[PDB]
Design a protein around this ligand. Structure first.
Ligand code: PLP
Ligand code: PLP
Lengths: 379, 378
């Protein structure tokens, strides 16, 4: 059956295994797993390639159908079909939202640290950005936007959220989402919720909650970004979708997208459909494997005498506080000890490193031993 | 190689979905009904069977074969740093309009033309100067220095298309150097769309890139190329833009970041396999399209109200239907079983665009529908 302990060689076109191509450094940085795609995804792609023709394609009605069924059955959120807008990636959906829902004098609000494109998009669009620092509470990274009221200027317009949160891995609860909703209403902000990791919730008894499912007011003021790219390791194809219930906001979004952003690949539609249509047993087995990998990394990091890490509620990263080392560059430090992490400076906190434990357990054990060898003793 | 194969498409093809339930032959969108070359299909399945579809790097193989293809086929030496890979060509046109013109500046192209040539400036707030094509020696020629006094002075980007999309014109040396001097005379940056360059049908005539005329041409130009049209893989859209100028290349890349994503992982492999091992398949396609073209041109000029120039580059198809006395010639042929591209989309509603990129048996069934509709439907 499913065997996530398989080790592949790349020796491919993967950006992950080519940054440290000819160096003895373990790639554990970019947010993709080393897992072979589900059989349903590969078999669907083969049936489409053997079809022969690759002309201009239409948007997948099958993907829109399986996406609606998934949002209603797994998250309790009924989706109207015309709310969907398919995109070639999630990063492009973040940029279009900023260019379309903000003007030159208006600003954006998000958390810090966060997925780098969240404050890179206002930077490229000529928009100033307001950042609210995440604070640790009960071994969880929580967001307190209400404690940043007086730091605002009235120019704020677009609220950029991330649930589950990259890189912290926090799965926001219902009370915390309703607090972020009340913050958006009190300041009359538009919300852009990035929910790419919604399928990777590991905590039992806790369900991912879409922001636009809280009420009809949240739905009419927000845009929801979702994709099976990270759930099924098909980011190299990049089939995603945006859910905009507001008709006027959808027209402003599509007008900003038209011509500048192309349509989704013909083969990317086939993989994204098979991922959400029949890949669920594969995704179930990956969660158990990732939780076992997560628990090992979490217990190992807390024993080392210079690192702190919150157990991520959502796989598969990986936020390690390396401020206890005292080095001027924690990411460059681990690189000279054969460990290639994502530098936290790109996320807005040069004291952290992002750990990608989305890999076979044999490779994780070798990474954990290089961490033990690096800190002890001594360096 | 055998292009007379009849492939059925009730699938995701945009071509055959527009008239999926009706008895109308689809001959409108600019893709062919031909099966992709075996080298492209084998390369995809080899990449699919690897299993992992994570983030990919820029194909150095596609960059290598693109540099060699420009030298062998067109006599144009490309530096590796000039290449910028894009997911599609329409996105490249929109980036060039927004990175090389400001709100108070205008663009110049021909008319009729590929619709995104005047839509992209319209959707970007730029005014557009259209230079009409006149019929000269049974060829749609472009005369830019005839509209000199019609230019305001805000023109900055010249939008070329070699070969032409509806007209199918393949420009010569004396013609391309004329529009280069026209761009030098008015300090115009050039965006040359050359996605049909591998589909030249005239014997003894080579496609000539705009930036290959002189070093000054290369420092002011943007060349868009892709195997999407020639190898029928527009559903993947692995394109590339060459920009010899470092300043214009920085503006282009800055205008792309975040908005336009990277090229698909599978799109890199298919485009790499196309230009590396697909030339025998393309050579067989050119002979097949040249025979289909001559059949259409002979039949369309024997018909009464229609006229058409023989296109120099496949696979359309620009038929003049003004001699029919109808308002919408595309709607007229639609109710008689023929789905063409209305010339109104291109800037001349009196025309219809025939897409003869199909097996010859299907083309003959489309020509008979033209006779029955014209002998005599009125
Ligand atoms: C990985 C990641 C993405 C991926 O987006 P792509 O455009 O498919 O590369 C989007 N959002 C977040 C928060 C991510 O971590
Ligand atoms: C068909 C056509 C294209 C197609 O561009 P894609 O992005 O590959 O779909 C581009 N330019 C011209 C002139 C065309 O006729």
């Amino acid at each position: 059956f499913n065997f996530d302990q398989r080790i592949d060689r790349r020796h491919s076109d993967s950006l992950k295994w080519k940054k440290y191509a000819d160096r003895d450094i373990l790639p554990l940085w970019i947010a993709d797993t080393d897992f072979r795609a589900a059989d349903c995804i590969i078999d669907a792609l083969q049936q489409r390639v053997q079809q022969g023709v690759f002309g201009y394609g239409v948007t997948s009605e099958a993907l829109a159908e399986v996406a609606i069924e998934r949002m209603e059955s797994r998250f309790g959120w009924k989706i109207q079909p015309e709310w969907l807008v398919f995109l070639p990636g999630v990063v492009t959906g973040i940029n279009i939202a900023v260019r379309a829902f903000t003007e030159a004098h208006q600003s954006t609000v998000s958390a810090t640290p966060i997925y780098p494109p969240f404050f890179l998009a206002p930077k490229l669009a000529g928009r100033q950005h307001l950042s609210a620092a995440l604070r640790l509470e009960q071994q969880r990274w929580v967001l307190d936007l209400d404690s940043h009221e007086d730091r605002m200027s009235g120019n704020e317009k677009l609220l950029l959220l991330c649930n589950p949160h990259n890189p912290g891995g926090t799965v926001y609860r219902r009370k915390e989402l309703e607090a972020q909703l009340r913050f958006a209403q009190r300041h009359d902000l538009l919300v852009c919720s990035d929910e790419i990791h919604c399928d990777l919730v590991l905590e039992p008894g806790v369900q991912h909650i879409p922001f636009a499912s809280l009420s009809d007011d949240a739905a009419q003021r927000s845009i929801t970004l979702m994709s099976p790219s990270k759930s099924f390791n098909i980011a190299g194809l990049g089939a995603s979708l945006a859910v905009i219930p507001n008709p006027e906001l959808r027209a402003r979004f599509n007008r900003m997208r038209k011509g500048m952003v192309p349509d989704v690949d013909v083969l990317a539609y086939v993989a994204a459909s098979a991922a959400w249509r029949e890949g669920q047993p594969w995704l179930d087995a990956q969660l158990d494997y990732l939780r076992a990998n997560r628990d090992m990394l979490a217990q190992h990091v807390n024993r080392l005498p210079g690192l702190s890490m919150v157990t991520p509620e959502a796989s598969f990263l990986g936020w390690i506080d390396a401020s206890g080392l005292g080095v001027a560059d924690p990411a460059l430090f681990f690189e000279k000890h054969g460990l290639g992490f994502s530098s936290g400076r790109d996320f807005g906190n040069d004291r952290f490193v992002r750990f990608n434990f989305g890999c076979p357990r044999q490779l994780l054990e070798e990474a954990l031993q290089r961490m033990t060898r690096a800190l002890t003793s001594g360096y």
